[PDB]
């Protein structure tokens, strides 16, 4: 029920199943989820996709950066002096543990939330240590974050400058799409057709969410060595290209492409092969993952 | 409002905030028998 | 109304006397009795899986009906410890039986401590909330009448759970002739008594729901085994209480959990060894003592590539230096503190989570998660006595432990200065008008800051590029700079490592569904904890050669000529840097189990600082 | 005291605690028990004998 945005639909598809967590024989932890950033214009259905994805996840919470009406964003714990119990206000992050948070207005977030989210996103906790206690809450959540660029839309003159988020919160992500509706007469007239078609017309949702939970609980997708070697080759090529664009522009790129992004492709491939519940994802799956990643990288090299 | 009294397997089946359709028995307390009289806590 | 015999009690006592009788078996419970007799401790901890395997029916009976069953157990214990030593068994009017093991269905949480488990020894994890004053309770009270030169001993039965009568609760004060009786406090007998409150852990508890807690009555033997905030597993008898007398009752029966034992649920005080493991550590030390630090350093933190100097430094932290408290209490600290500053996606937070999972008593502190009063301690009134109590903070909890500071850059200046005396002297001197104290937090700090601008600019100096004062960077004793060089060659290195670890699986245990000194050398790739734990205790003194060499190298570092032009200092060389040299030397020697810090460790320390501190800013 | 079904929204929930259904008492002189007294259900106390 949204016109186009086909890469974004497939991205949401991969997001909803997410990767596969790794606890290693030493003890460290690596995430098994995917983050989707959706920078761009007002007109496109960014908040509407956020709305649907919250509806369609098994457990998911769609909030603003500025907390929520009588609900925070991160968790907090506070002593109660009368009864001495450490009451635990549950934010979106913990109230949708094991789930999909859909943050909106990620640009416009609290500073305390910014810090706790830097800890929380790629590594799955929210630590809090009040006067008496020292907790470490469990926050297993996949992020669908929207935002507008500062200057209303994406002006071409401010490319590599028209984003206000920090690189140390674009690092955490696994694919970051910009959305601008610049010059497409046919697309826009067809879009008018599409939206009023929705207006007049108004698998299945329940089946899809059940299937999502089913894949996530049943299969652990984990790539094969040939797929790993292909990803290695394209990773060196991608990082060389990012370095090349950096030195060409002579100013440091406004969006990291890192080992986090390597592992983002790994998680994306795992989720894709989770769509078929095959515990060895194929080089074809990793190729389509790189395709989605290049459609994410359209802005970085740009 | 209404004070509600659960029982063995009606306990902890509902968490604060969950709307319910709940089937039970209206009753007044019985603990041994304010400008009003004959008004026990229902 | 003395009972002549009961088949139930006789049977149960016979069964548990057999269970304690361990000679034809390996001697485990006999050894437990002998060691507790040697200790003077008077509780013996019997594993429920042992009881179940030797007699499942008795385990079912006991875990369904505790108190009388444990009376049988404890009478058997008294008879048994009397046979081993009658003299010691006579010493204590009772001996007790703690529990342990797999309380399978009998492991719930205070949210799930329903009314099905009454008089059943329940197992429950949770966080303490309160610590009532541990106050005496009289058990056998002696009196003296001076008019009649008389002595009496009134006797009390611990009916904390059963029905209690005034005739049992009388405290005598006059004789039959209405004379005055004077209590004999010393000749009387008392047992401590404390109440505490376990709570469902917020990490375990439901996200959006209020806490739920259970009351726990620790009598003697369990006085100070649980303070507020601690993680504790309590196993014991949920029961009902008697309402005090009165012709009416509502049905309410406020319930408790008379704990049978409580253990530290952290499960990080784990020195569990065997003599074979001790010999293993001893040979591991002595055979290759000179390369052992590099062995450990390369070993530590697998599932990450390179950063070998940082692994060496985190070893220097975890192994620790040696605290020094001189003649007049001038306490010179013996902890390392490391500041990871580096580009994003450099596994800094992964190192932090590694030390969280490994180092005992490790605790995480976020930038604006924890804040000041949370970080260090606090003073607050009781409101039940109008008296000022002290609430130990994160650092004080982490006394003789580790704190992992995520996003150290984001702590505001108030807290960044509040950490000062814990950073240097490892104490927090707190005070308000009623109460003052110097809480002791001999902590160690591994802190992962991030650079200004969100990523290090190579050409800019480190002091410009770090948003942190020289004041604090003095107190930190090492500052390690982690750059993402972005070269394809080292990218191939890191990438192959990372994807190998993405390919590593639970060996054999998994099929496709998601959730010894040396290691079996898995191509795709415990004793760490054992060895570093034993390593912490040694106090390797500095040799004259090491002290002179470390002194001269420090003088060289202070002199400006030691840094060439085009390099920029990352931390000014105050005398804290010399003490850093000594502490890192001691940590290396402790790795070697040296018993003396030698020139090898000294030159390793100087190598460490020379790489860590002076940075080559490029043009 | 009829059978009523209603719609509502919970806004809190006290703890799960222990109310009795059978209670045995015993005398203070002869210690004879009077076991198995039918304690009533709901909020309804019971004056002791
Ligand atoms: N492609 C589209 N087709 C139909 N309706 C759309 C489309 N894009 C946006 N809309 C409408 O615009 C409204 C607001 O868009 P929104 O979801 O807030 O995205 P943004 O946050 O970028 O404005 C939605 O309620 C939706 O009905
Ligand atoms: N030195 C390294 N060796 C192997 N993998 C690394 C290294 N540095 C970063 N990574 C990868 O990049 C990711 C970065 O995660 P994290 O450490 O949480 O963020 P940051 O590095 O910004 O603190 C890790 O999941 C890890 O897989
Ligand atoms: Mg929006
Ligand atoms: Zn009587």
Curated annotation (Swiss-Prot), chain B:
Transmembrane segments: none annotated. It is found in: Nucleus; Chromosome. Belongs to the MCM family. It is linked to Meier-Gorlin syndrome 8: A form of Meier-Gorlin syndrome, a syndrome characterized by bilateral microtia, aplasia/hypoplasia of the patellae, and severe intrauterine and postnatal growth retardation with short stature and poor weight gain. Additional clinical findings include anomalies of cranial sutures, microcephaly, apparently low-set and simple ears, microstomia, full lips, highly arched or cleft palate, micrognathia, genitourinary tract anomalies, and various skeletal anomalies. Early fractionation of eukaryotic MCM proteins yielded a variety of dimeric, trimeric and tetrameric complexes with unclear biological significance. The MCM2-7 hexamer is the proposed physiological active complex. Component of the MCM2-7 complex. The complex forms a toroidal hexameric ring with the proposed subunit order MCM2-MCM6-MCM4-MCM7-MCM3-MCM5. Component of the CMG helicase complex, a hexameric ring of related MCM2-7 subunits stabilized by CDC45 and the tetrameric GINS complex. Interacts with ANKRD17. Interacts with MCMBP. Interacts with TONSL; the interaction is direct. Acts as a component of the MCM2-7 complex (MCM complex) which is the replicative helicase essential for 'once per cell cycle' DNA replication initiation and elongation in eukaryotic cells. Core component of CDC45-MCM-GINS (CMG) helicase, the molecular machine that unwinds template DNA during replication, and around which the replisome is built. This is DNA replication licensing factor MCM5. It comes from Homo sapiens (Human). The gene is MCM5. The chain holds residues 244 to 292 of 734 of the full protein.
Swiss-Prot record, chain C:
ADP binds at residues 350, 390-392, 394. GO terms for cellular component: alpha DNA polymerase:primase complex; chromosome, telomeric region; CMG complex; MCM complex; membrane; nucleoplasm; nucleus; perinuclear region of cytoplasm. Keywords: Acetylation, ATP-binding, Cell cycle, Chromosome, DNA replication, DNA-binding, Glycoprotein, Helicase, Hydrolase, Nucleotide-binding, Nucleus, Phosphoprotein. The keyword Signal does not apply. It is an enzyme of class 3 (hydrolase). It is found in: Nucleus; Chromosome. One of its GO terms (molecular function) is ATP hydrolysis activity. Its main location: nucleus. Component of the MCM2-7 complex. The complex forms a toroidal hexameric ring with the proposed subunit order MCM2-MCM6-MCM4-MCM7-MCM3-MCM5. Component of the CMG helicase complex, a hexameric ring of related MCM2-7 subunits stabilized by CDC45 and the tetrameric GINS complex. Associated with the replication-specific DNA polymerase alpha. Interacts with MCMBP. Interacts with ANKRD17. Interacts with MCM3AP isoform MCM3AP; this interaction leads to MCM3 acetylation. This is DNA replication licensing factor MCM3. The gene is MCM3. The chain holds residues 4 to 659 of 808 of the full protein.
